[PDB]
Amino acid sequence: GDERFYAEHLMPTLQGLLDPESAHRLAVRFTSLGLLPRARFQDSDMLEVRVLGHKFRNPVGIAAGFDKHGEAVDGLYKMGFGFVEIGSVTPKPQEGNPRPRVFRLPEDQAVINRYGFNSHGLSVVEHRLRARQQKQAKLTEDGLPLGVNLGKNKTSVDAAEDYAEGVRVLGPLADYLVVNVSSPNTAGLRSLQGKAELRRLLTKVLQERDGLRRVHRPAVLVKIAPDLTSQDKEDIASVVKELGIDGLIVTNTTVSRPAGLQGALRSETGGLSGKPLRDLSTQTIREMYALTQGRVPIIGVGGVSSGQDALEKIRAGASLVQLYTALTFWGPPVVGKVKRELEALLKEQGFGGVTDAIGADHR
Ligand SMILES: Cc1cc2nc3c(=O)[nH]c(=O)nc-3n(C[C@H](O)[C@H](O)[C@H](O)COP(=O)(O)O)c2cc1C
Numbered sequence: 004g005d006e007r008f009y010a011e012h013l014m015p016t017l018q019g020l021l022d023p024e025s026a027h028r029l030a031v032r033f034t035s036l037g038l039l040p041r042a043r044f045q046d047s048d049m050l051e052v053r054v055l056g057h058k059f060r061n062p063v064g065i066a067a068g069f070d071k072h073g074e075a076v077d078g079l080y081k082m083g084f085g086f087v088e089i090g091s092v093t094p095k096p097q098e099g100n101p102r103p104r105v106f107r108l109p110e111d112q113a114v115i116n117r118y119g120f121n122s123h124g125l126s127v128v129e130h131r132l133r134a135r136q137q138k139q140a141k142l143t144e145d146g147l148p149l150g151v152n153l154g155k156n157k158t159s160v161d162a163a164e165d166y167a168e169g170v171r172v173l174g175p176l177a178d179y180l181v182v183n184v185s186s187p188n189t190a191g192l193r194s195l196q197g198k199a200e201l202r203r204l205l206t207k208v209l210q211e212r213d214g215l216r217r218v219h220r221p222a223v224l225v226k227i228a229p230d231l232t233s234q235d236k237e238d239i240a241s242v243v244k245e246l247g248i249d250g251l252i253v254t255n256t257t258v259s260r261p262a263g264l265q266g267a268l269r270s271e272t273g274g275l276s277g278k279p280l281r282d283l284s285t286q287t288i289r290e291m292y293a294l295t296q297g298r299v300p301i302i303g304v305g306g307v308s309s310g311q312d313a314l315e316k317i318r319a320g321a322s323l324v325q326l327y328t329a330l331t332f333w334g335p336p337v338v339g340k341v342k343r344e345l346e347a348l349l350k351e352q353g354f355g356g357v358t359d360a361i362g363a364d365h366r
């Protein structure tokens with residue numbers, strides 16, 4: 004009922020009336036106030052996952068970017084996400100790029116963005132999270148954890164120090180932290196995925212994390228691009244093993260423009276998300292799982308809009324999945340839709356639960 008009305012009526016109307024940045028701001032506001040269908044799907048036990056030091060009631064999370072500044076956390080749980088990731092947050096506030104900076108490709112079920120880390124900054128977000136810190140502590144205990152994704156300011160003269168500052172300020176408020184070294188929209192950032200740069204950066208990040216007190220000590224994940232060479236992937240895996248990085252987020256948006264895109268806006272500069280990214284991301288997950296011998300948890304992201312897409316990533320090696328762009332097209336009912344379909348497919352394929360399907364294609 005709801006899935007059809009949103010997909011066929013509400014979302015096309017919002018899109019017809021509002022440019023995508025305005026529509027996103029409205030969405031953040033509505034979600035922050037809880038103006039959502041409170042989701043009727045009740046998570047079954049087959050969807051629970053234990054990973055990263057935590058219980059996850061379901062494996063479907065909201066990807067970084069939708070709640071950049073931590074304004075809508077509780078609304079996102081209400082929407083039925085198993086986990087929420089906020090950010091990217093940068094140390095100092097910054098505006099990001101000039102508008103327009105986000106573009107719909109509806110013929111492709113895709114988006115292109117070049118926000119450039121618009122961020123309220125660490126201090127603002129610190130105080131927003133602290134206002135609900137114990138409400139989160141209870142949510143985390145009940146199987147609903149919180150991730151915090153860290154970025155770098157545009158004019159920073161020392162990237163590693165930007166990340167270290169994020170660890171110190173928001174680490175104590177997060178169940179996991181993400182070192183985002185894969186935005187395509189900050190000059191030079193993606194060079195931090197290079198072996199020597201990444202080793203130096205992550206050694207500093209881990210030292211800062213390990214300095215936090217035990218109950219305030221988050222897991223640390225690295226978020227990587229879908230456009231890496233084979234050498235780059237191998238190098239990342241090696242570093243993740245050498246340093247004991249807790250996990251990987253696979254993938255960010257692509258700077259590629261796959262053949263076949265139809266949208267008028269396909270040649271706009273920025274990272275591409277949604278359906279055209281899906282299988283490039285799945286493949287990246289598959290490679291990274293193999294390279295790390297299945298011993299490094301992966302959160303899989305890029306083009307998930309169905310239960311089949313979720314399960315493909317899980318079977319490829321993801322322990323958890325995230326989505327963003329599917330919301331622009333299908334709206335909030337897509338969350339329940341993914342979960343219901345995933346549970347149905349797990350049963351059909353003879354898995355006892357999600358946990359049994361992680362990496363199943365490799366076996
Ligand atoms: C508008 C927009 C903004 C985003 N901003 C961030 C970000 O601040 N940090 C980050 O790590 N990823 C960011 N992402 C990437 C998403 O987290 C995700 O990796 C990507 O969009 C693929 O998932 P999807 O196809 O489900 O949207 C952003 C994506 C979009 C569409």
Ligand SMILES: COC(=O)/C(C#N)=C1\SCC(=O)N1c1ccccc1F
Pocket residue numbers: 013017029030031033034038039040334335
């Ligand atoms: C005029 O805008 C709305 O009616 C929205 C929005 N945005 C509504 S009504 C119920 C609902 O869920 N949303 C919504 C919330 C977040 C994302 C997309 C949405 F359509």
Ligand SMILES: O=C(O)c1cc(=O)[nH]c(=O)[nH]1
Pocket residue numbers: 068091116117118119120121183185186187188255256274
């Ligand atoms: O702020 C952005 O431009 C953003 C950051 C990121 O990591 N990924 C992305 O697609 N956009």
